[PDB]
Design a protein around this ligand. Structure first.
Ligand code: UXC
Ligand code: FE
Length: 284
């Protein structure tokens, strides 16, 4: 039988709440209490609420600032044109600055106008099925906390810096928003195996994707765009690159503690969208 899946945007209320050891904040209680604070905001959020605005601490804003300054040095030569186009809009309308962490509510309002995408705060990891299902309604489940200040370059756990600098500029691009939504739509009520394959295709596009633009390789994956060292590595000659091809890409193991072994290159967001359309027919 078909598994339960959301049928309207408010149905995400029933799944978005269905949620380390080497972590830099593992032994810090103040950090743990703060993370509990953010988790509770997500857990208590219901669709229709304004996303609670948070007063970030001086330590958190400096951590953001450090990440923000280094990444911005690289974007002009590493990011795709769509990312570079949208990033200045975020600074002007959402307060993206070295000394200010943007509020999810402001970013959500920006995206709703541009592409109909919206943000929902998420306490932690959801199942692949639940996470993908939000995309079907142009809802991106977003972390709201900040990485521990002891290591501003600690990336294996996504934080709000990753969401705001990695994902948000692309969600404001119509072609990318359509591509993303169609992953969500394909996942709705799909088999467990199909959800795994879509989640892997998502991983090697939305999170670690490369694209070809005017004969050059650029980066569009959010995970790369928020990771200083891997952003450089991905466009270096040391990275292994292969064509995005869902029936192949969906078999690739997703790595979390190290650089990817391989990166997949999409011709464009429209082409990646077309390839997924052909692929999803065979798994659903
Ligand atoms: C389809 C796999 N998948 C899943 O199955 N469940 C999820 O909840 C989920 C998820 N992918 C993401 C987004 C993400 C992870 N990640 C790791 C980096 C390193 S960069 C980055 N971006 N999330 C959001 C949770 C992570 O904080 C909430
Ligand atoms: Fe991400």
């Amino acid at each position: 039988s078909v598994p339960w899946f959301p049928k309207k945007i408010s149905d995400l209320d029933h799944c978005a709440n269905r949620v380390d050891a080497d972590h830099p904040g593992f032994k810090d209680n103040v950090y743990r209490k703060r993370r509990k604070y953010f988790a509770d905001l997500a857990m208590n959020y219901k669709h229709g609420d304004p996303i609670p605005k948070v007063e970030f601490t001086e330590e958190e804003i400096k951590t953001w600032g450090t990440v923000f300054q280094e990444l911005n040095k690289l974007y002009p030569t590493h990011a795709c044109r769509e990312y570079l186009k949208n990033l200045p809009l975020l600074s002007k309308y959402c307060g993206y600055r070295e000394d200010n962490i943007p509020q999810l509510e402001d970013v959500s309002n920006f995206l709703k106008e541009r592409t109909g995408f919206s943000i929902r705060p998420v306490a932690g990891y959801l199942s692949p099925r639940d996470f993908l299902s939000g995309l079907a309604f142009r809802v991106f489940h977003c972390t709201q906390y900040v990485r521990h200040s002891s290591d501003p370059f600690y990336t294996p756990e996504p934080d709000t810096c990753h969401e705001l600098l990695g994902h948000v500029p692309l969600l404001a691009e119509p072609s990318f928003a359509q591509f993303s939504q169609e992953i969500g739509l394909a996942s709705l009520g799909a088999s467990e195996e199909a959800v795994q394959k879509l989640a892997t295709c998502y991983f090697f596009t939305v999170e670690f994707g490369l694209c070809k633009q005017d004969g050059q390789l650029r980066v569009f994956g959010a995970g790369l765009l928020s990771s200083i060292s891997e952003l450089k590595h991905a466009l270096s000659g040391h990275a292994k690159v292969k064509p995005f091809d869902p029936k192949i890409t969906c078999k690739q193991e997703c790595l979390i503690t190290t650089f990817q072994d391989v990166y997949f290159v999409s011709e464009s967001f429209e082409d990646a969208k077309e390839k997924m359309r052909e692929f999803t027919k065979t798994i659903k």
